[PDB]
């Protein structure tokens, strides 16, 4: 529908305007974190982020054109990849740290507070390092996030989704053309960016196994997180 019509510059504006807000952690606990308390904060935060993500997806040109069945499928497939690329983007300006929220900025060693989390932290930090090395721009980031949403479940059911993916590719190349990158540099950078999505898929699968491992059952997960987690079993 609407989405294929758009200008590259328009597509970027539609996607910048759709960006969900940055949410805050609960202030209490406001201490050195325990396993149970750290798990509590992250569960609460992820659950509120998920509600904003669902509403962001509806503002992604082309997504509302899909049937409810297909929107559900894409979101069940992509939700943790989307949380993770958001986390990685927010964490750009804090090398060696993860900005879960402005009042929840965690170092590698705080990763150890939960068992099996430091492995995923390290992968997330590595992705933040890579985005910085590439000088990832906000306009590219919003393109990558929409590609994850439309791409991650497309194989697991298509023509329309592939046409919108082609449009977001056009938009990324458009953006790199305007920064004055040569044709060679544009296709090189387009490749480097899309190869990161393979690493983000890997981190999502590791994080998903981590979330299944809880139930442990220290902290109950929200009804929404459990719904999304159970779409991956």
């Amino acid at each position: 529908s609407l989405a294929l019509s758009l200008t590259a510059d328009q597509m970027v504006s539609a996607l910048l305007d759709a960006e969900p807000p940055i949410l805050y952690s609960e202030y209490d606990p406001t201490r050195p974190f325990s396993e149970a308390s750290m798990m509590g904060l992250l569960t609460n935060l992820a659950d509120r982020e998920l509600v904003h993500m669902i509403n962001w997806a509806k503002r992604v040109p082309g997504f509302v054109d899909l049937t409810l069945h297909d929107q559900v499928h894409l979101l069940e497939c992509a939700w943790l990849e989307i949380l993770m690329i958001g986390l990685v983007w927010r964490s750009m300006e804090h090398p060696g740290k993860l900005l879960f929220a402005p009042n929840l900025l965690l170092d590698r060693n705080q990763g150890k507070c939960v068992e099996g989390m430091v492995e995923i932290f390290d992968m997330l930090l590595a992705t933040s390092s890579r985005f910085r090395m590439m000088n990832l721009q906000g306009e590219e980031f919003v393109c990558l996030k929409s590609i994850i949403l439309l791409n991650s479940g497309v194989y697991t059911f298509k023509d329309h989704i592939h046409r919108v993916l082609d449009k977001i590719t056009d938009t990324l190349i458009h953006l790199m053309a305007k920064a004055g990158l040569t044709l060679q540099q544009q296709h090189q950078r387009l490749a480097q960016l899309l190869l990161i999505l393979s690493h983000i898929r890997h981190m999502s699968n590791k994080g998903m196994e981590h979330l299944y491992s809880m139930k442990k059952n220290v902290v109950p997960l929200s009804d929404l997180l459990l719904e999304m987690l159970d779409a991956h079993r």
């Binding site: 669902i54 509806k58 409810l68 559900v72 979101l75 009804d223 719904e227």
Partner: peptide, 9 residues
């Protein structure tokens, strides 16, 4: 599904 609700809401 809560996901169905929020996608319609």
């Amino acid at each position: 599904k809560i996901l169905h609700r929020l996608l319609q809401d």
